[PDB]
Design a protein around this ligand. Structure first.
Ligand SMILES: CCCCCCCC/C=C/CCCCCCCC(=O)O[C@@H](COC(=O)CCCCCCCCCCCCCCC)COP(=O)([O-])OCC[N+](C)(C)C
Ligand SMILES: CCCCCCCC/C=C/CCCCCCCC(=O)O[C@@H](COC(=O)CCCCCCCCCCCCCCC)COP(=O)([O-])OCC[N+](C)(C)C
Ligand SMILES: CCCCCCCC/C=C/CCCCCCCC(=O)O[C@@H](COC(=O)CCCCCCCCCCCCCCC)COP(=O)([O-])OCC[N+](C)(C)C
Ligand SMILES: CCCCCCCC/C=C/CCCCCCCC(=O)O[C@@H](COC(=O)CCCCCCCCCCCCCCC)COP(=O)([O-])OCC[N+](C)(C)C
Ligand SMILES: CCCCCCCC/C=C\CCCCCCCC(=O)O[C@@H](COC(=O)CCCCCCCCCCCCCCC)COP(=O)([O-])OCC[N+](C)(C)C
Ligand SMILES: CCCCCCCC/C=C\CCCCCCCC(=O)O[C@@H](COC(=O)CCCCCCCCCCCCCCC)COP(=O)([O-])OCC[N+](C)(C)C
Ligand SMILES: C[C@@H]1CC[C@@]2(OC1)O[C@H]1C[C@H]3[C@@H]4CC=C5C[C@@H](OCCC(CO)CO)CC[C@]5(C)[C@H]4CC[C@]3(C)[C@H]1[C@@H]2C
Ligand SMILES: C[C@@H]1CC[C@@]2(OC1)O[C@H]1C[C@H]3[C@@H]4CC=C5C[C@@H](OCCC(CO)CO)CC[C@]5(C)[C@H]4CC[C@]3(C)[C@H]1[C@@H]2C
Ligand SMILES: [Ca+2]
Lengths: 92, 92
C-alpha cells in the first residue's frame, strides 16, 4: 500500500508542479495527499485543476489532464482492492 | 458498477445542464462525479442546486429537483449494494 502511494504521488507532483527546485516539500507532497485519500478525502476540487470549480486554477498547464486518470486508478487500488484486502485478511 | 454510473450520470447531466451543444465535456461529466461518489465524496453542496447553501445557484431550473432522488438511489447501489458485494467477494 506504500508503493501504490508513491507510484501515484511521484507522477502527480511531477505532472502538476513542474518547476520545483530541490526541496524537502518534495518528500511530503509525494506522500501527503495520497495518504489522506485512503481515508476517503478525494480532494475533489483539486482534480482537474484546469476546471472552473478548481481550488487550484494556477496549476493548470501541460500534462495536468493526466492526474484524474492516475487517481482513478489509484483509489480503485487503495480503497477497493487493497483496503478491502485488509478486511478479508482480518475476517479470515 | 459502470452501468449504474452511467445510469446516473446521463440523467443528471441531462437534467442539470439542458443547453449543452455537443462537446467532449459530455464524456467526462457523465463519468466524473459519479466515480468520485463511490469513494465517499457526495458533493453535498451541489445536490439540490436550488437550495440556499448551494455551490451551484445558477444550475437551478426545471427538473433539477430530481437529482437528489437519483443520487439517493445511486449510492445505495454504489456504496451499500455493490461496494459491499466486493467485500463479500474477497472475503469468500
Ligand atoms: C517504520 C514504518 C514507516 C512509516 C512510514 C514512513 C514514515 C513517514 C514519512 C514521511 C515523509 C517525511 C515527511 C517530512 C519531510 C520534511 C518536511 C519539511 O521539512 O517541510 C514540510 C512541512 O510539513 C511538515 O513538516 C509536516 C510533516 C510531514 C508530513 C507527514 C505525513 C504523514 C502522512 C503520510 C505517511 C505515510 C507514509 C507512506 C510511505 C511512503 C513541507 O515543506 P515546508 O516548505 O517546510 O512547508 C510549507 C511551509 N510554508 C507554507 C510556511 C512555507
Ligand atoms: C467510458 C464511457 C465514457 C465516455 C467515453 C468516451 C471516449 C471518448 C474520448 C475521447 C478523447 C479525445 C477527445 C479529447 C481531446 C480534445 C482536446 C482536449 O480537450 O484536450 C485536453 C486534454 O484532454 C485529453 O487529452 C483528454 C483525455 C484523452 C484520452 C481519453 C481516454 C482514453 C479512452 C479510455 C481508455 C482509458 C484507459 C483505462 C485504463 C484502465 C486539453 O484541454 P484542458 O484539459 O483544458 O487542458 C489544457 C489547458 N492548457 C492549454 C491551459 C494547458
Ligand atoms: C479497460 C477498462 C476501461 C476503464 C474505464 C473507461 C476509461 C475511462 C473513460 C474516460 C472517459 C473519457 C474522458 C475524457 C474525455 C475528454 C475530456 C476533454 O477533452 O475535456 C475535459 C477535460 O478533462 C479531462 O480531460 C479530464 C480527464 C478525464 C477524466 C477521467 C475520470 C476518470 C474517472 C472515471 C473512470 C471510470 C469509468 C467508468 C465507466 C464509464 C473537459 O472538457 P474541456 O472543455 O476540454 O475542459 C474544461 C477546461 N476549461 C474549464 C479550462 C475550459
Ligand atoms: C419518507 C419520510 C419523509 C417525509 C415523507 C413525506 C412525503 C410527502 C411528499 C410530498 C411531495 C409533494 C410536495 C411538494 C410539491 C410542491 C411543489 C414544489 O415544491 O415543487 C418543487 C419540486 O419538488 C418536488 O416536486 C418535490 C418532490 C415531489 C415527489 C415526492 C417524492 C415521492 C414520494 C416518495 C416516494 C419516492 C420513491 C422511492 C423510490 C425507491 C419545485 O421547487 P424547487 O425545488 O425550488 O424547484 C423549482 C425551481 N425553479 C422555479 C427555479 C424552476
Ligand atoms: C482504447 C483505448 C484508447 C486510449 C489510449 C490512449 C490514446 C490517447 C493518447 C494520447 C493523447 C494525447 C493527446 C491529448 C492531449 C491534447 C491536448 C494537449 O496537448 O494538452 C496540453 C499538453 O498535452 C501534451 O503535451 C500531451 C502530449 C501528448 C501525450 C503525452 C503522453 C501521454 C500519452 C502516453 C501514452 C499513454 C497510453 C495509455 C494506455 C493505457 C496543452 O495543450 P496543447 O494543445 O498541447 O497546447 C495548448 C492548446 N493549443 C495548442 C490547442 C492552443
Ligand atoms: C407512493 C409513491 C408516490 C410518489 C410517486 C411519484 C408521484 C409524483 C409524480 C410527479 C411529481 C410532479 C410534480 C412535482 C413538480 C412540481 C414543481 C415543478 O413543476 O417544478 C419545476 C418544473 O417541474 C417540472 O416541469 C416537472 C413536470 C412534471 C413531472 C415530470 C416527470 C417526473 C415524474 C415522472 C414519474 C416518476 C414516477 C416515479 C415512481 C417511482 C418548476 O416549477 P413549475 O411550477 O413547473 O414552474 C415554475 C414555478 N411556478 C410556475 C409555480 C411559478
Ligand atoms: C525506494 C524509494 C524510492 C523513492 C524515494 O524513497 C525510496 O527515494 C528517495 C530519494 C529522496 C530524495 C533524495 C534527496 C533529496 C534532496 C533534498 O535536498 C535538500 C536541499 C535543500 C532544501 O532547501 C537544502 O537546504 C531534498 C529532498 C530530496 C529531493 C529527496 C526527496 C525524497 C526522495 C525522492 C525519496 C523517495 C520517497
Ligand atoms: C454503451 C454505452 C452507452 C453510452 C456511451 O458509451 C457506450 O455512448 C457513447 C456515445 C458517446 C458520444 C458520441 C459522439 C459524441 C460527439 C462528440 O462531438 C465532438 C464535437 C466537437 C467538440 O467541440 C468537435 O470539435 C462529443 C462527444 C459525444 C457526444 C460522445 C460522448 C460520449 C458518449 C455519449 C458515449 C457514452 C459513454
Ligand atoms: Ca468516507
Amino acid at each position: 500500500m506504500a508503493l501504490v502511494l508513491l507510484s501515484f504521488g511521484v507522477p502527480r507532483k511531477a505532472i502538476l508542479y513542474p518547476h520545483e527546485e530541490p526541496s524537502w516539500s518534495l518528500a511530503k507532497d509525494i506522500v501527503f495527499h495520497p495518504y489522506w485519500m485512503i481515508f476517503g478525502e478525494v480532494y475533489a476540487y483539486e482534480i482537474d485543476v484546469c476546471a472552473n470549480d478548481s481550488t487550484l486554477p494556477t496549476i493548470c498547464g501541460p500534462g495536468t489532464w493526466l492526474t484524474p486518470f492516475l487517481q482513478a486508478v489509484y483509489l480503485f487500488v487503495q480503497y477497493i482492492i487493497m483496503v478491502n484486502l485488509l478486511i478479508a485478511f482480518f475476517n479470515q
